[PDB]
Amino acid sequence: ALKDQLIVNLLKEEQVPQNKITVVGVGAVGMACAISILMKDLADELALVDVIEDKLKGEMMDLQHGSLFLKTPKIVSSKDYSVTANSKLVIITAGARQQEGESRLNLVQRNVNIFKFIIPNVVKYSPQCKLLIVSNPVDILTYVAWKISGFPKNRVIGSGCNLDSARFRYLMGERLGVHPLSCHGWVLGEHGDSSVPVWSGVNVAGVSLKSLNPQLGTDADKEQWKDVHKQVVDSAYEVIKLKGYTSWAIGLSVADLAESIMKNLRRVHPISTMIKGLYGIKEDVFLSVPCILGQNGISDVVKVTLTPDEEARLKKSADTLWGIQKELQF
Amino acid sequence: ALKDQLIVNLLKVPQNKITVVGVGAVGMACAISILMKDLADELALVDVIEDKLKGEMMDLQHGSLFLKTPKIVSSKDYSVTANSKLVIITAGARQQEGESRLNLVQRNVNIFKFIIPNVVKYSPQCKLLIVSNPVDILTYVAWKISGFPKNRVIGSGCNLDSARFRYLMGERLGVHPLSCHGWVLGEHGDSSVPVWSGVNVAGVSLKSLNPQLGTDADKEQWKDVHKQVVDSAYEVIKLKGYTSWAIGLSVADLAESIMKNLRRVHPISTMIKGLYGIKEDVFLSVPCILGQNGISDVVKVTLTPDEEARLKKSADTLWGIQKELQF
Amino acid sequence: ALKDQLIVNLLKEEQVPQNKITVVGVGAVGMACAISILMKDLADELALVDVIEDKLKGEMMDLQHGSLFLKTPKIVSSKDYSVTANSKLVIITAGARQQEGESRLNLVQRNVNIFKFIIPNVVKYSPQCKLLIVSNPVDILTYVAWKISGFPKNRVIGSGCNLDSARFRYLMGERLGVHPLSCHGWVLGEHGDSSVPVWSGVNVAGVSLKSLNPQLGTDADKEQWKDVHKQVVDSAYEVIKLKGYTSWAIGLSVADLAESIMKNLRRVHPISTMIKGLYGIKEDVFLSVPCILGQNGISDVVKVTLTPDEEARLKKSADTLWGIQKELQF
Amino acid sequence: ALKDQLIVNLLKEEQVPQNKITVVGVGAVGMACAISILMKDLADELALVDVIEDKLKGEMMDLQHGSLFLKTPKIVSSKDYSVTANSKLVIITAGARQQEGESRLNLVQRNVNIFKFIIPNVVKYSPQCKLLIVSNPVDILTYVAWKISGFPKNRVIGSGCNLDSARFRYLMGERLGVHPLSCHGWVLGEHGDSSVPVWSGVNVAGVSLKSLNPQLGTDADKEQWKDVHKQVVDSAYEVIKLKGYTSWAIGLSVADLAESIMKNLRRVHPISTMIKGLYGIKEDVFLSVPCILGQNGISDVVKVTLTPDEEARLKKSADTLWGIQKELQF
Ligand SMILES: CNc1nc2ccc(NC(C)=O)cc2s1
Ligand SMILES: CNc1nc2ccc(NC(C)=O)cc2s1
Numbered sequence A, C, D: 001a002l003k004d005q006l007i008v009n010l011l012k013e014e015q016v017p018q019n020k021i022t023v024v025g026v027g028a029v030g031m032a033c034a035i036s037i038l039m040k041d042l043a044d045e046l047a048l049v050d051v052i053e054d055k056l057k058g059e060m061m062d063l064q065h066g067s068l069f070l071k072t073p074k075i076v077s078s079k080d081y082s083v084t085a086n087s088k089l090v091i092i093t094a095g096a097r098q099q100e101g102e103s104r105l106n107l108v109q110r111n112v113n114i115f116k117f118i119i120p121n122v123v124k125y126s127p128q129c130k131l132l133i134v135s136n137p138v139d140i141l142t143y144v145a146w147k148i149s150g151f152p153k154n155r156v157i158g159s160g161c162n163l164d165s166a167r168f169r170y171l172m173g174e175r176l177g178v179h180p181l182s183c184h185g186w187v188l189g190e191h192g193d194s195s196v197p198v199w200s201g202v203n204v205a206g207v208s209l210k211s212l213n214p215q216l217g218t219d220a221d222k223e224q225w226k227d228v229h230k231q232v233v234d235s236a237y238e239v240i241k242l243k244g245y246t247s248w249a250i251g252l253s254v255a256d257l258a259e260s261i262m263k264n265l266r267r268v269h270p271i272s273t274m275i276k277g278l279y280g281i282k283e284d285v286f287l288s289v290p291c292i293l294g295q296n297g298i299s300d301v302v303k304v305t306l307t308p309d310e311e312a313r314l315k316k317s318a319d320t321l322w323g324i325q326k327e328l329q330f
Numbered sequence B: 001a002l003k004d005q006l007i008v009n010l011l012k013v014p015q016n017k018i019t020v021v022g023v024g025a026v027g028m029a030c031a032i033s034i035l036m037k038d039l040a041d042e043l044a045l046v047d048v049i050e051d052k053l054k055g056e057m058m059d060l061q062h063g064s065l066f067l068k069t070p071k072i073v074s075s076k077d078y079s080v081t082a083n084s085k086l087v088i089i090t091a092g093a094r095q096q097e098g099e100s101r102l103n104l105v106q107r108n109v110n111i112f113k114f115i116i117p118n119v120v121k122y123s124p125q126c127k128l129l130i131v132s133n134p135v136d137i138l139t140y141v142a143w144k145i146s147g148f149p150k151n152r153v154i155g156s157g158c159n160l161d162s163a164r165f166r167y168l169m170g171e172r173l174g175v176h177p178l179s180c181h182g183w184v185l186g187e188h189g190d191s192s193v194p195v196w197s198g199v200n201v202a203g204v205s206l207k208s209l210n211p212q213l214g215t216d217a218d219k220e221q222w223k224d225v226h227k228q229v230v231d232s233a234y235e236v237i238k239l240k241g242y243t244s245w246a247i248g249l250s251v252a253d254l255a256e257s258i259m260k261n262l263r264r265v266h267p268i269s270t271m272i273k274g275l276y277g278i279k280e281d282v283f284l285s286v287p288c289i290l291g292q293n294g295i296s297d298v299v300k301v302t303l304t305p306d307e308e309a310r311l312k313k314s315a316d317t318l319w320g321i322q323k324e325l326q327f
């Protein structure tokens, strides 16, 4: 054989991937996660799982054909979860998505049913994985993943408000003429209608914008900064209305979270976690708060100081989400 | 104003602007890969479907926190493309299941009659990167319509075909594609030419280890690797309905050589009149040095009698189509 | 020629670089700036200039030999400033540097005299450039480079406290178990002994550490956070005491500023610019305050809200700098 | 405590890194390897070891102070090898270095002695690491580390001719007006004076320069391409004369090798390995041939077809190294 003429093999294999990531679902969100992760060099192996064989194989092939331009030497796919074995991070994007005028919360019974199959099959083959949930309603489905998997809370993460805050910071940037990296501000709570802009923390160079205008984000605000939060809440729906779905931004947001996990960075992200014990919340609610993210998932939670109004808005989001949790049928 | 309370302003054009024409799957794959390789300080998108266009723009803009391209704009109106260093054309009818890219030619020539003069109007000194199919004929057309000197009119050509060939060779050999070397030239399509004479790892000619390499007499039928290269788009189209990611990555690799003036060699579409035994204004892929002025030099690959035959055949097939077309 | 057999030239070769950077000085600082810039792919041409013929050629050669691993296709050097033609960014690292036990301010007479030569030669060949001053005392020398150059003040930028703030954020993250990217805090004023830690802006996820612990950074602070700023002031002197000089941190700091300039990012950095008009300051003092940095340099200045003590401290830094700058002749 | 007021901790972590790299030796070569590996985001922990305590701690601090600009969250140093525990890759750059005019082979007994201390300490704390030898003479010192470590030969790699081949490709590029990435050519054998340029493999776009010019690299060569290989052999001496040492190109070369290993790329590099059984070599000689390099080190060797003259040169290189190697006191 030509190969053996050209190459002397010196070593019996033992290929056990060291930085493997799995993306479950090859819809537009999942493939946006994939290309973003590939282009950030975060993994030595990428596996894709879905239920439509042809679509899955074609997406796998299309990525493989770009390998020259990449640094991820093994891209694989199967309907069978054994392909995901030894993943450090498994990203769940499968399930029904919201239509125009439909709340993400309306997706819950359909995606719970799907999760009942996906989660046990995922955790089966990857004892070291973190589970990053992207499917919606993301906060409820992170709770669901946690309950079905039996994983400890640090290992079950929801993409949560990482995108909402990125959007908030983009829109703020545009108003001030400053790059979003230098515009700081947190949208917490539900990834959806009841999210909470934390005006008290919104700043450039440590300068509190609320300190300069204490009516920031209220109806009295002459510059109507609340509209920036409204734009954040409406963003997914506006993009859905224009191009049919969203993909690129969530892909990049998920890639940003993957980077923190895979590279043990311990950056702070507003992502879905259990918050029993904070802000007077006494039940097992999952919602976005600022969490320190690394190789063991969420190891630490930042206790954001909230005004009485912000705290009320967060408890409100927490009641909403708990109310849907009480509808869950395991 | 809050802004004025916060910031003292002291000072009232982009220098590395890229435009992508067409926000179909190819176009948007180009856009995401360009954004993720930090090649541009402004990205403009142009298409004719207003809602689709604005939505893709917005979806990109929402990821800005995670990118280093501070201005992302879109419009149907080509004034948005002004001052582009590079303009990438991906628009037009796209390859369909079970059909040659050559089936798309007249309709795309018609559309280029509109797009190209509008691009030239707002960026008279850009480099044009044609991706639309059939890319070899459309690169020629772009050149004729624009009036640009030929160095500034480049087709994505066989960059991707060669990438696919090096992936497949790497999979056979257990080696990364970066370390597997080999060229697919000619048409970006069914008449492409694998230059077996050049295929090598670490400077070791595979033909030296297997003289029949790529012929019918090759006991390990490496010709099938080229067959896989030719069929690849057809199979991917059959499976997922179009191709996007590999071509976006390929186009971004080329944008990088242009924007960074790398002078790397790529098998990309250029006018081959008076080279490799060819007499008409045919564009096809040969290895070209690519940089800030586009294509400045061509590598004269030493072709076997056959490889030269296949290459002249690929040229004939294309000039066959190009001949009998109206513009 | 083999070249002509191999290659047909189709185009006359009128090369003019589009993203050229020059580094003046190939001491440890300049070469650290060089390698960091080269590894962030910010330039299509790198020019080096110094006065020691052999050292310059050797440094250039060593970089050139790495070209396969880089994406900067032309690296050149010369004593003659014609080598620097057409630069978009020129970085000045040349001049005397402080010994152990010597103030950066003690370098000023030597480095003013050298700037009288360097600055007109840079401007002669790079009429479109921004000037990034790194040579010390950086605040006074930015003022000097501005005066000599005839450039507008937006295009004459001092590396300032970009490094001091990076040190502060590193030390803070170390204490808190958080990546520096998520620890926010500004050190302003002189890049030197009179710098000001802005405790009122120090935060994680928008949470003010001073609201948590009002004594933050005072002598009554039970965790002695003032020790963090003292480590920042002393950093250069400690590293100089240990390895003889500093290089890697300042190289990375300068590369960070080069990125914002070359990619027109409009990030906010604490860098040296004129502050006449703010904080009661009447004279042409240059010091660090947070500025928006982009392709035309510093286009905007953020007005940080300072406590009375912080502001008094910033005004004293200005006074210190004016004390030396008022005596300069050039 | 302020940390606890700010942050709630969820779990006591496994603080064991997944992608740890250690650099032994913090002279110019070691620190250029360090800055390059930092800027390529290859590791989640960088450990430095050397024997001079002050210089060691100064270099650690200087790197540490740039953390904000990096994605390597822990940088540590110690003269104690406990600091290196759980390294995936340990890069040995320590020992005496070429003075001006000095042959790398002249360093051999000094560096074998240093290695009798270094290697067992490294192996104690990372029994599963790959070893990357950079110290000179690198071929013989790779043999020494292999013998002392007791590792299987796949896990003991010498940086070899990776740099010599990068230099060759740089020079060919500047001759042809092509980027080094698109110029191909292999320099094999000893990293030093007896290296062998393989003229038969020298190509652009698969076009053999020898096919164009049948006298390429020979005494008859109109254009004296052999000068190009002479320049490769002479490069380190020239740079040492000019700047006193070499650092940047070797830093970049070592980082490129680290990348292949750490990301399991399975690229081919001309690096130091045992070539017993090739080219009629009957003894445990280490020298550079093209090797497939990945997460288990050197898994495969490409068999280059050499002319009789090229093979004779290569066996000459083999004999030279074996003369010294075969009599080592250890
Ligand atoms: C077990 N049921 C399902 N598994 C999966 C896995 C992936 C996907 N994909 C999408 C895009 O929703 C859908 C389903 S439905
Ligand atoms: C007739 N003019 C046209 N311009 C454009 C510009 C972009 C596109 N988009 C695609 C993907 O075909 C289609 C057209 S048709």
Ligand SMILES: CNc1nc2ccc(NC(C)=O)cc2s1
Residues within 6 Å of the ligand: C024, C025, C026, C027, C049, C050, C051, C093, C094, C095, C096, C113, C114, C117, C118
């Ligand atoms: C008097 N002019 C001078 N120009 C330069 C340019 C560079 C340097 N080098 C350093 C490292 O200070 C020193 C001088 S002195």
Ligand SMILES: CNc1nc2ccc(NC(C)=O)cc2s1
Residues within 6 Å of the ligand: D024, D025, D026, D027, D049, D050, D051, D093, D094, D095, D096, D114, D117, D118
């Ligand atoms: C006692 N053995 C030694 N270990 C080491 C470790 C590092 C270095 N460093 C250099 C610069 O040679 C030298 C030695 S000598």
